[PDB]
Symmetry: C3
Subunit: 123 residues, 3 copies
Amino acid sequence: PPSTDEIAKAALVGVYNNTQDINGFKVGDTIYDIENGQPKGRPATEDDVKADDFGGLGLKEVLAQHDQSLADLTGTVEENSEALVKTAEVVNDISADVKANTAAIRENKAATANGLETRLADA
Amino acid sequence: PPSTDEIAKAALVGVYNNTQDINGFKVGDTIYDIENGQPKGRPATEDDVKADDFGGLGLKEVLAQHDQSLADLTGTVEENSEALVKTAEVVNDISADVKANTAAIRENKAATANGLETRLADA
Amino acid sequence: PPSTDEIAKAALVGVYNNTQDINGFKVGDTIYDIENGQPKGRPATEDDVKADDFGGLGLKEVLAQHDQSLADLTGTVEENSEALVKTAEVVNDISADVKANTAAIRENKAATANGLETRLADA
């Protein structure tokens, strides 16, 4: 069987490894495992750091980076939403002016006494 | 050296601390450390909660909040993408009408017997 | 009291559980607890997997999924930002053409000798 002493040491080493998973590690930090039922330390190299799923940052630090990313990205998305509204307002305005002008173009597309005397004269 | 008993107790306390990191803690939860090689508990105060990198939420809960944020933010981004397409369609439509009207404005910008008788008469 | 042996075993089991929280588990993985101060294993069923807050993925894997989501979503948001700029440029262009045409429509909306002789004749 494993003695109480071996169990205890394996638990302590396990705890250390989870603590590095949570809090991160860097070049030169001790990395521990169990060998001959004894804890054995060696220094983390840059290869160990690169082999870690998150480059040794630890879960807490990656989560903090995600908080910053989320807040920043939400800010850009908010700026884009407002730009969309402003653009839609302008476009509707332009849509009214193009129709008013169309109607104007349509509209502007408009294109005895004698016997007595004789007897006397005879004398 | 540290006895088996001290190793075991330090491992148990280490486990408890990682478990609080993962699952969170709140005011009044016991916080444990090792003193004189013995585990020692004290109550978490609001100062301890505030001093934690994630306010005592724990890694699981912060990750759940990130799941909700991601799903919500992706929904807004999806709404913005569709608004963009609808806006582009309308704008292209307007772009066709402004050119048709321009051409119309261009186009509408258009702006013996006698001797015998005598001898007789003599008589 | 709890013996050193019980403390050690409880620490080892605690470590295993945190390690599954961090790294994930799947159907058929051993799940351990403490019973009669002894560690006791049983196989994870699909019910256990479903009962886990993240379906047994583990914190590292959920964080990796969040990295992929963040990078992808940031890419869409970047595409939307550029589409917005291109749309705004086009709209401003159209806004200039609608005003030029308006002014054109306005402008095109334009709509003794005798006594001597007698004495002689008498002879």
